[model samples]
Target: MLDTNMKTQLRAYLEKLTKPVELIATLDDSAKSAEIKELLAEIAELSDKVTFKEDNTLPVRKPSFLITNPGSQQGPRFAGSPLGHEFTSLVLALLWTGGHPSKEAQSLLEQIRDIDGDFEFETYYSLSCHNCPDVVQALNLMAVLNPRIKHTAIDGGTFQNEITERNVMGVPAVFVNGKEFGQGRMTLTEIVAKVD
Candidate 1:
């Protein structure tokens, strides 16, 4: 649900894209499904390098959209409407997926790229949590940097049952390869060091 001013500002931000990006969504009949569709439509309309499509076969996570660069890699995924505090996360994911450079240090980016094995990161985040974006964006960036790594940022509030099943006690709870990774705020360097 982007208003006029929001659209103008988003369009300005998206103009920096250096490559094509796709938002492929797997949605159901819920209200969030419509919200996600609208958000994807607005994003696709704003930038020529961006495209949106609904392909439920990609992932079974309802109301989720995967950010990807067609031939390069399938990047980070957001399993809910990445609005509110996570709005910046969504925008940054798009920019990064479209080949815009990240502000992270070169050494850290190399470290992320060099991480070994397949890291399947699932992060549960509350949309209102101030600390959630750091973890979400960090893991998302990792997924973007290393195609072997995959991340899905899930909205804890929307998926309370899943949160409980996973025994996540707070915001920004992360699991790597179906095992507990950490909790709370974590910088990209901190996460990388732990992974290393």
Candidate 2:
């Protein structure tokens, strides 16, 4: 599903990996499954540090992919094709999961690492929403840096039933431990403070 330009940029990003990352997909027989398969295959071929696998037994939404270190359970996940505005979120997730240093301050990173309690974050975002990536990337980075946190960025367009049931009214609706955390765009600093 990636174009030539995207491949070139993705290749450059993949080159920065210092750790091996695995893209494990839980897919169904849907059109999005085809898209994710093609996307993950192309991503894996772009870097030796990346490998793709299909694991239907993974506890994730259908047509989703988990970005994690090989043999590790803690990392961020994307529930649906993270194209459009969310594509940058996907790229950052890959970069962070593969051990690239983030621009977050050292103190903030420590703060995230110091936070007590297990946080399961689910953010519902629309692909077309321009503000969604900030929250998506923020939570994804948290999950990557802190083992106590787990995040999933779910595309609202793809999971209509969950969105309806959750009473999600807009893009970038964030839930932590099954309750609303925030809505609209949120910076990493803001999110960290609130969680702290």
The numbered model that scores best in lDDT is 2
Model 2, which residues run further than 4 Å from truth? none
What local distance difference test score does each model get? 0.88, 0.91
**Per-residue lDDT of 49-115 in model 2, one digit per residue for the tens?**
9999989887679999899999887899999878888888888999988889998889888889899
Candidate 2 whole-model C-alpha lDDT, 0 to 1 = 0.91
Which window of ten consecutive residues has the lowest lDDT sum in model 1? 52-61
Screening candidate 1 with a backbone cut-off below 3 angstroms (N, C-alpha, C), the clashing residue pairs are none
Tens digit of lDDT per residue, candidate 1, span 114-135?
A: 8888889999998799999998
Off by over 4 Å in 1: 3-5
Cα lDDT for residue 77, model 2?
Answer: 91
- Pick the TM-score winner: 2
